[PDB]
Design a binder for this molecule. Structure first.
Ligand SMILES: [Zn+2]
Ligand SMILES: [Zn+2]
Length: 52
DNA sequence: GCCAACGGTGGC
DNA sequence: GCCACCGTTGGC
């Protein structure tokens, strides 16, 4: 839907730890106010372009 | 019951 | 129209 499942980003298992989206995650100390996938995991086909 | 992460939105 | 945010919920 937002995932082609076939691109580099869909195949990643590891959050980068460093992008705006990662720094938001509780697992990285963030306040969980934004709540999107790591930038490197945003499907290059299907994702909002501004998430890429 | 928690959580990843989506879709909708209010304010700009 | 954008985007920061947050309500929602499938999957666990
Ligand atoms: Zn990241
Ligand atoms: Zn993809």
């Amino acid at each position: 839907a937002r995932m082609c499942g076939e691109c580099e980003a869909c195949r990643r298992t590891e959050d980068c730890g460093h992008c705006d989206f990662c720094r938001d995650m509780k697992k990285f100390g963030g306040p969980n106010k934004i709540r999107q996938k790591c930038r490197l995991r945003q499907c290059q086909l299907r994702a909002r372009e501004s998430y890429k």
